[PDB]
mmCIF file of all heavy atoms in Angstrom:
data_model
loop_
_atom_site.group_PDB
_atom_site.id
_atom_site.type_symbol
_atom_site.label_atom_id
_atom_site.label_comp_id
_atom_site.label_asym_id
_atom_site.label_seq_id
_atom_site.Cartn_x
_atom_site.Cartn_y
_atom_site.Cartn_z
ATOM 1 N N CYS H 16 -9.278 57.141 -8.956
ATOM 2 C CA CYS H 16 -7.895 57.471 -8.683
ATOM 3 C C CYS H 16 -7.761 58.961 -8.464
ATOM 4 O O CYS H 16 -8.498 59.762 -9.123
ATOM 5 C CB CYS H 16 -6.942 56.967 -9.708
ATOM 6 S SG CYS H 16 -5.245 57.041 -9.132
ATOM 7 N N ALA H 17 -6.791 59.394 -7.668
ATOM 8 C CA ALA H 17 -6.495 60.756 -7.376
ATOM 9 C C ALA H 17 -6.110 61.588 -8.628
ATOM 10 O O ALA H 17 -6.253 62.809 -8.649
ATOM 11 C CB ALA H 17 -5.392 60.923 -6.317
ATOM 12 N N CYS H 18 -5.626 60.882 -9.685
ATOM 13 C CA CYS H 18 -5.290 61.525 -10.977
ATOM 14 C C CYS H 18 -6.507 61.731 -11.921
ATOM 15 O O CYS H 18 -6.317 62.219 -13.026
ATOM 16 C CB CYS H 18 -4.261 60.623 -11.662
ATOM 17 S SG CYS H 18 -4.899 59.020 -12.205
ATOM 18 N N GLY H 19 -7.761 61.367 -11.431
ATOM 19 C CA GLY H 19 -8.944 61.587 -12.233
ATOM 20 C C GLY H 19 -9.410 60.368 -13.024
ATOM 21 O O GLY H 19 -10.471 60.455 -13.606
ATOM 22 N N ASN H 20 -8.637 59.288 -13.040
ATOM 23 C CA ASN H 20 -8.980 58.093 -13.762
ATOM 24 C C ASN H 20 -10.022 57.291 -12.943
ATOM 25 O O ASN H 20 -9.731 56.955 -11.800
ATOM 26 C CB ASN H 20 -7.786 57.306 -14.219
ATOM 27 C CG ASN H 20 -6.971 58.018 -15.285
ATOM 28 O OD1 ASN H 20 -7.556 58.856 -16.004
ATOM 29 N ND2 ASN H 20 -5.689 57.739 -15.365
ATOM 30 N N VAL H 33 -8.282 55.156 -4.715
ATOM 31 C CA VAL H 33 -6.867 54.717 -4.829
ATOM 32 C C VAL H 33 -6.003 55.913 -5.097
ATOM 33 O O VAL H 33 -6.232 56.652 -6.024
ATOM 34 C CB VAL H 33 -6.721 53.591 -5.869
ATOM 35 C CG1 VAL H 33 -5.258 53.046 -5.811
ATOM 36 C CG2 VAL H 33 -7.685 52.453 -5.654
ATOM 37 N N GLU H 34 -4.924 56.089 -4.255
ATOM 38 C CA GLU H 34 -4.034 57.194 -4.430
ATOM 39 C C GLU H 34 -3.171 57.068 -5.672
ATOM 40 O O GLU H 34 -2.860 58.113 -6.247
ATOM 41 C CB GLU H 34 -3.113 57.270 -3.191
ATOM 42 C CG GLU H 34 -3.842 57.565 -1.901
ATOM 43 C CD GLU H 34 -4.535 58.939 -1.791
ATOM 44 O OE1 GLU H 34 -4.149 59.804 -2.590
ATOM 45 O OE2 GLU H 34 -5.454 59.050 -1.001
ATOM 46 N N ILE H 35 -2.835 55.838 -6.109
ATOM 47 C CA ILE H 35 -1.952 55.616 -7.206
ATOM 48 C C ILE H 35 -2.506 54.479 -8.077
ATOM 49 O O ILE H 35 -2.609 53.285 -7.596
ATOM 50 C CB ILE H 35 -0.498 55.322 -6.774
ATOM 51 C CG1 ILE H 35 -0.037 56.270 -5.644
ATOM 52 C CG2 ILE H 35 0.439 55.364 -8.002
ATOM 53 C CD1 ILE H 35 1.357 55.971 -5.129
ATOM 54 N N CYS H 36 -2.851 54.737 -9.356
ATOM 55 C CA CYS H 36 -3.252 53.718 -10.298
ATOM 56 C C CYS H 36 -2.111 53.454 -11.342
ATOM 57 O O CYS H 36 -1.083 54.159 -11.267
ATOM 58 C CB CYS H 36 -4.571 54.113 -11.015
ATOM 59 S SG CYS H 36 -4.374 55.507 -12.225
ATOM 60 N N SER H 37 -2.330 52.503 -12.220
ATOM 61 C CA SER H 37 -1.381 52.156 -13.263
ATOM 62 C C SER H 37 -0.982 53.347 -14.139
ATOM 63 O O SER H 37 0.140 53.345 -14.693
ATOM 64 C CB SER H 37 -1.935 51.030 -14.098
ATOM 65 O OG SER H 37 -3.282 51.312 -14.509
ATOM 66 N N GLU H 38 -1.839 54.342 -14.282
ATOM 67 C CA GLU H 38 -1.588 55.498 -15.164
ATOM 68 C C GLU H 38 -0.751 56.570 -14.429
ATOM 69 O O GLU H 38 -0.098 57.355 -15.167
ATOM 70 C CB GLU H 38 -2.905 56.040 -15.701
ATOM 71 C CG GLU H 38 -3.550 55.095 -16.738
ATOM 72 C CD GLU H 38 -5.029 55.121 -16.804
ATOM 73 O OE1 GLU H 38 -5.662 55.049 -15.696
ATOM 74 O OE2 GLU H 38 -5.595 55.114 -17.890
ATOM 75 N N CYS H 39 -0.765 56.633 -13.108
ATOM 76 C CA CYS H 39 -0.018 57.660 -12.406
ATOM 77 C C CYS H 39 1.160 57.119 -11.535
ATOM 78 O O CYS H 39 1.936 57.893 -11.000
ATOM 79 C CB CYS H 39 -0.950 58.524 -11.517
ATOM 80 S SG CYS H 39 -1.678 57.577 -10.183
ATOM 81 N N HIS H 40 1.292 55.766 -11.489
ATOM 82 C CA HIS H 40 2.482 55.168 -10.712
ATOM 83 C C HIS H 40 3.733 55.622 -11.411
ATOM 84 O O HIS H 40 3.934 55.417 -12.625
ATOM 85 C CB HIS H 40 2.372 53.664 -10.598
ATOM 86 C CG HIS H 40 3.093 53.123 -9.472
ATOM 87 N ND1 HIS H 40 4.468 52.739 -9.480
ATOM 88 C CD2 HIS H 40 2.740 52.898 -8.169
ATOM 89 C CE1 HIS H 40 4.828 52.266 -8.330
ATOM 90 N NE2 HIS H 40 3.786 52.374 -7.492
HETATM 91 ZN ZN1 ZN B 212 -3.887 57.343 -10.967
#
Side-chain angles (χ1 to χ4, degrees):
Chain H
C16 193
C18 68
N20 291 335
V33 186
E34 296 297 339
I35 317 176
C36 73
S37 47
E38 290 148 315
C39 66
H40 204 270

